[PDB]
Symmetry: C6
Subunit: 219 residues, 6 copies
């Protein structure tokens, strides 16, 4: 990663063994459950493109997912290059070449060029741009590896309301879109797919009931 | 988090893999037992709103509770917005715009703006405001997910007094101000002791410490 | 905690995850065995009142003991306030208000006021004063949760002398008073409650025998 | 390793016990699965040749592979020596002699000469040259120790498409440029799908993403 | 402990949770095997008397040994006091009073006075004096708690010579100067070998190394 | 160990608990397998003689090996003293006495004298000299505790060539001499002790076949 020293300079630091192990283990145990995204973002804080490639390369298995990840990165790299055409010309003494999509992804850039971009003034944060592409890709994998659709979450006749809301939002969280789309899913399904006893109780509460009030009413 | 370095400057640091793992593990093993609140507050020392969102997003399961958490944040955010009316105007070079409710929660603010506020002179502790909203929300979850009421905690005829007082205060801590929690001790606590110990505790008279009550019902 | 930076200034540091886990685990495994006191004192090195409250709040179970702890803190807080009456008046630019008992315990003080007291010149060590109250309380719990009295430690007819001295001093250590009181207990009971074979051997050694000599003589 | 301290100077540091243990454990559990290469590269960040030799020497077993590693280092070292003819002459007070192939591998160079080269102005990154030779050698071991060929990876008649693509790319990663690895996807991958999914994938037509192919053979 | 920081100043640091845990665990698993002494000396590097008392107080069980430890400290403390007669007089602003025996053990000295002595110019290493008394006491415990005498360690008729020499020196290390420990080797070691190996070792003659003796009784 | 601070000064640091545990555990699990040597060298990076004695003293068991280690150290100490006769005379204000063999081994030197030697300008690296003696001794133990001779490594009639080369070089690695002696062992035995099928294949390859080519030919 790139961290600040006590001189105020952004300097390269080696990825720690603890960081490597934490990412390998979380994929091993949690696969592509939705909480893999925040874990990857936090463990990759300040990462260079080399570090991000290191983390993803240490993943054993799920190679189908990892190949989908490269294809996502490619489309975003192609989009970056079409929005940022590089201008030919000698690079000045105190300057860095402009990065391509392949440079952000680390396939045509050295770690020293990545450090130069990320510690420039102003910085060009190729690590954070790459991370955005990867997380975009990981969001697709989470949505694809989600077993259940939101339309199949129906409260059982003896199922506690808390367990049903647990399943509802767990399923909704794996299908990542905008929250405009997830507020619409709740208003459409959460009360309507409650069991007949709890459904009649919540209809009387009205659309303005908070979830805390809804969960108290079907206790 | 934003911590002070070895020279006296407030700097951003990445959340450590140990901090991430410790919070995930505590929710896994302890759910929303009352001791989850101090663990979250301590593990989030100096956290930015991004860090707090990271910690909350790494929680697997309990998505109904986490959704109640979201609803609580909204009410407090709306209260914050109603107490801090917006002032339109260009933000000056040196200073920073005033944060809205959605900015404290980190949903409409970048990490650099959160760092900018916290290292301002004087600091606007958006991380601590967000943390307070979260703990307010987590406190509600502990109360809702508490299985037993304090009025149902009563000492068995052969149960040692220590075990009953253990159950009593464990339940009371889950049942959340001291206006009536102070009230449960010494008035409900004696009433639900078994007849053998209850007769002993009348003889002790008012003003007995819990150490005196526990000594008196040892045998 | 409050630690020194390289500038010579006492600055606040976040309580580490390792410190939190160590205290939670030691209570889990050792309950209120006497070695819980030194572990708590060492793990709370440099703690603020907030940190001390954090540690105690993370304890799961033993809520009867924890309530006895608050009552001890209250008496010591009441004693502090009666020995340190606060003098009303505006606090000067370069000064701190005088702390109440409730301020030392952290119920009416912010963490910033605790930092101000502890890093003042000269410092008013509210964290170390609070720690003294807590450890005073923990000493009472260890004495109360001790199963055996010193008068019941008698050497068995086939029990090795080392095992008996182990039990003797383990029991004596849980009943914490002054060592004047513990030297008196040894001179009163250690030889007199030895088995008849070892007792006659040690009587000949006389009162001036070291324990190493006593343990060698009954090998 | 040679890392930058908190002030901006490149200093030698001892390899940490965690780094040593992490590398030993990864070889123990993963042998020469493809993900061993990124783990070794990351754990050896900033390594001197002595550090790289330390890591390789701590490997227990797989001594045939480790001997193949030695032979690879020799060929690259001999290539290095053939591209860098020796210049005889007294080495000047300030500067350092040119490193031979055996010097990069650390067999004829002391640790202080390796530090001297790496902190030179400009640096001669002997640690990174050695690391590159090692990874070149480790890449050969992964290919030789890969049990299955990509031409033998074919989808079963009842095997889910995700599991087959998982096996496909796991094998391809073990079978080492993208000149023909790009070729295996989309041409060999469709051919070895089962007849049910194979018929579906013809209908998708050329240019289908892997996400589209995996969605189309879900059911 | 008192350690040197990154700038060259001797500063007090809190004993780490890992140091506390490591010492507790080593006593739990190894008791007073001889290797407990080096572990305690190394884990207490730079310790203050308070730190040494902390480590000793965290030991659970073995309270008879710990009491023998207390008696040893008293004898050495009394010897220290007899060699350092007290000088009455007001202590000067800059300097510190001379420490008594009870001050080195930390029972009548505060932690700040122990820090003051150790950072004095020249230092009075009260922590190292206390540590030496403790190790003197712990050495006695290892001898008393050693089950077997070196005179009872003899090679079996079918026991491999390596295993017998292993038992021999393990016992000798437990049986504590080299005045007669040097004596046990080469004179008692040959005498207690079995007749087959014993006959071989006479033929080797005086001056054989242990490597030569172990090679000669391999078969 | 002796590490560099940020002032550029070589200063003493306490041996870490992690370093102590790592060395104890690696001996426990791996005994004197050849990889114990690099682990000991890396874990003892920058060690003083006191630290090296600490590490070796923490080893439980294998006391026969540890006694052979002292005898090796003695011969090397005697050789050092006969090559470096000390010159009598008062030591100057800014100087250190010359170290004996017993001073390098730490039996007649204080830790402060070891720090003085190791941080002198120029340094006299008693820690690295001692380490050379210890590793010389550990090499002898590895050779002695090796069960199998290189002449007994013969490929089985159904044994895969990789497994045979594994055994061959594992055995050769435990008998440490020069690589001139180990190149001679390979050319003498590796092909000649292959099974008749693989032997005839490799004879046709000729003496110039790399191991990678040899292992491919007997797949
Ligand atoms: C990527 C990254 C940089 C980031 C970020 C990031 C940024 C902001 C916010 C956030 C914070 C507070 C509020 Cl009040 C809202 C809001 N208020 S709202 C009602 O929509 O209008 N919205 N947000 C997101 C916004 F603004 F982006 F929309 C938020 C989140 C929350 C964090 C959070 C998690 C939690 F458990 C409980 C909380 F109180 C807050 N995370 C999510 O909400 C994800 N989630 N999704 C759904 C579902 F789909 F089921 F509905 C569900 C969640 C859920 F909250 F977990 C919970 C079960 C429900 N994260 S990171 C740190 O991962 O690296
Ligand atoms: C989490 C966080 C945000 C914080 C904080 C926080 C802040 C202040 C205080 C506190 C300090 C001193 C006093 Cl004298 C009182 C007081 N005296 S009184 C008579 O009420 O007026 N009260 N308090 C709480 C105050 F201030 F909130 F009111 C306090 C606590 C105590 C600390 C504590 C914990 C403990 F285990 C044992 C102790 F001896 C002291 N913790 C609690 O009390 C929690 N608790 N709750 C209840 C219940 F409700 F069931 F009865 C019960 C407890 C209990 F004490 F454990 C015990 C069984 C009874 N913690 S943090 C720093 O980790 O981030
Ligand atoms: C003590 C210390 C300070 C050091 C060092 C140290 C210094 C240099 C080198 C080294 C590096 C590269 C080459 Cl190309 C040669 C070479 N080329 S060669 C063909 O001989 O001409 N030689 N060397 C040693 C030289 F120069 F000293 F001879 C080397 C080693 C190798 C490290 C290594 C290990 C490995 F697994 C694979 C590698 F690619 C490199 N370690 C050894 O080789 C030990 N070993 N022994 C034998 C056997 F006996 F079976 F043959 C075998 C090995 C083996 F390699 F493991 C492998 C199975 C074969 N270590 S430390 C770090 O431990 O603290
Ligand atoms: C180890 C180290 C030295 C390094 C590096 C390193 C360097 C660059 C790149 C890389 C980055 C971006 C793109 Cl867009 C491409 C590209 N796009 S493409 C169409 O080929 O032209 N290719 N690459 C590799 C390049 F550059 F080498 F060609 C890349 C990688 C990727 C990172 C990655 C890993 C991952 F898991 C999932 C991802 F989405 C991305 N890792 C690999 O690709 C390894 N891999 N191999 C094959 C195989 F051969 F089987 F098909 C397969 C992979 C796979 F991706 F995992 C996936 C199943 C397919 N890593 S390090 C920094 O740790 O020390
Ligand atoms: C709270 C805190 C800040 C502190 C401190 C603290 C301060 C000083 C001392 C101490 C040191 C040396 C001597 Cl010679 C005496 C002494 N000489 S004497 C004979 O009395 O005249 N006295 N002391 C205490 C003094 F001075 F306070 F009295 C001491 C202790 C000892 C530490 C110790 C433990 C140990 F195992 C072996 C040792 F050699 C020293 N701890 C105790 O002794 C507690 N203990 N109690 C009893 C019993 F009740 F059974 F008798 C028993 C012990 C016991 F020692 F463990 C052992 C089985 C016997 N600790 S902390 C670090 O916990 O956070
Ligand atoms: C704990 C601490 C305070 C310290 C220190 C400490 C200080 C010095 C020395 C030492 C160093 C060099 C020599 Cl050449 C001799 C010597 N040569 S000699 C012929 O006697 O004259 N003697 N010594 C001890 C000295 F100086 F004390 F005399 C030494 C040791 C050795 C180091 C060592 C350990 C080891 F495992 C293997 C080694 F090769 C060397 N450790 C011991 O010897 C302990 N030991 N005891 C006996 C017994 F009594 F059973 F025979 C036995 C050992 C043994 F060696 F292990 C082996 C089976 C025999 N350690 S610390 C720094 O951790 O805080
Ligand atoms: Cl780490
Ligand atoms: Cl790790
Ligand atoms: Cl996996
Ligand atoms: Cl890269
Ligand atoms: Cl790659
Ligand atoms: Cl893989
Ligand atoms: Cl960490
Ligand atoms: Cl971790
Ligand atoms: Cl955010
Ligand atoms: Cl989100
Ligand atoms: Cl989830
Ligand atoms: Cl404000
Ligand atoms: Cl930590
Ligand atoms: Cl932890
Ligand atoms: Cl518990
Ligand atoms: Cl507080
Ligand atoms: Cl509270
Ligand atoms: Cl509880
Ligand atoms: Cl470490
Ligand atoms: Cl480790
Ligand atoms: Cl080397
Ligand atoms: Cl070697
Ligand atoms: Cl091996
Ligand atoms: Cl070069
Ligand atoms: Cl720690
Ligand atoms: Cl720990
Ligand atoms: Cl003390
Ligand atoms: Cl005590
Ligand atoms: Cl005890
Ligand atoms: Cl002195
Ligand atoms: Cl450590
Ligand atoms: Cl450890
Ligand atoms: Cl062992
Ligand atoms: Cl020493
Ligand atoms: Cl010794
Ligand atoms: Cl031993």
């Amino acid at each position: 990663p790139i961290v600040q020293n006590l001189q105020g300079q952004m300097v390269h630091q080696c990825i720690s063994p603890r960081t490597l192990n934490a990412w390998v283990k979380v994929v091993e145990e949690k696969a592509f459950s939705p909480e893999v995204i925040p874990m990857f973002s936090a463990l990759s804080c300040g990462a260079t493109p080399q570090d991000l490639n290191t983390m993803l390369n240490t993943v054993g298995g799920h190679q189908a997912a990892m190949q989908m990840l490269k294809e996502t990165i490619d489309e975003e790299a192609a989009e970056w290059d079409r929005l940022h055409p590089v201008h030919a010309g000698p690079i000045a003494p105190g300057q860095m070449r402009e990065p391509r999509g392949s440079d952000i992804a680390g396939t045509t850039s050295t770690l020293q060029e990545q450090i130069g971009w990320m510690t420039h003034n102003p910085p060009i944060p190729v690590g954070e741009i790459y991370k955005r592409w990867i997380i975009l890709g990981l969001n697709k994998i989470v949505r694809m590896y989600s077993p259940t659709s939101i339309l199949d979450i129906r409260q059982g006749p003896k199922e506690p309301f808390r367990d049903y809301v647990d399943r509802f939002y767990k399923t909704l969280r794996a299908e990542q879109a905008s929250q405009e789309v997830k507020n619409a899913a709740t208003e459409t399904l959460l009360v309507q797919n409650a069991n007949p006893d709890c459904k009649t109780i919540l209809k009387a509460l009205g659309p303005g009931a908070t979830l805390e009030e809804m969960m108290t009413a079907c206790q």
